[PDB]
Amino acid sequence: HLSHSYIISLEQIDGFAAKSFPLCMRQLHKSLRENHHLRHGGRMQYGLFLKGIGLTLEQALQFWRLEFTKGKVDSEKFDKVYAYSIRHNYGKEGKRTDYTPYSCMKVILSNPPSQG
């Protein structure tokens, strides 16, 4: 503990969800906080949106880790699986492209949601 010897914020995101978030993101956030888990489409959409608002790679990683850990899953499982997706949304791996946030046209014409 020698290194720790005396000699945008995640918390406000919820606040934003009250007013600024468009109804799509409001619904996604409500479901996420209700169940601490999102199917793939929701993960992609919400991750891209939180990238758009400005949540940095470290910030987004922390937020997703904290939110998913409550879903009764192993902590290491998150780094094993979802870390690559989170990195890719920010153009960190693979083709390494700064993927832009979904446009309303894409969201309307993107994968059609189903039950769940």
Binding site: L2, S3, S5, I7
Partner: protein, 114 residues
């Protein structure tokens, strides 16, 4: 060279190659560790605040080294006991901090920089 000294500390600057072999006290261990942590934190703060070639940087770093009693200036007199003590401090403290700053890559980088 009063009682238990030697040629173990010829020069002020050293590459910290040979680990210490002495038996020190727990109080000495803690004092040396904390003192060198203060020195390194002062180095980091002055590096952030000032340009390392600046005269303000040099003055403040000399003040900190004097306050914590670390070797910073040569002495063309001889190896005086007090000087020996200071050098011993430096040599042990460094390795103690090595033990403190080798667990994580981040920490390692920080240590190296300072």
């Amino acid at each position: 060279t009063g009682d238990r000294k030697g040629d173990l500390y010829p020069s002020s600057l050293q590459f910290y190659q040979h680990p210490p072999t002495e038996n020190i006290s727990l109080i000495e261990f803690e004092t040396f560790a904390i003192e060198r942590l203060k020195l390194l934190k002062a180095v980091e703060n002055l590096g952030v605040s000032y340009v390392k070639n600046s005269e303000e940087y040099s003055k403040k770093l000399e003040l900190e080294l004097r306050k914590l009693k670390f070797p910073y200036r040569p002495l063309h007199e001889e190896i005086s006991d007090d000087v020996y003590d200071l050098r011993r401090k430096d040599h042990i403290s460094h390795f103690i901090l090595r033990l403190a700053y080798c667990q994580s890559e981040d920490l390692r980088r920080w240590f190296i920089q300072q």
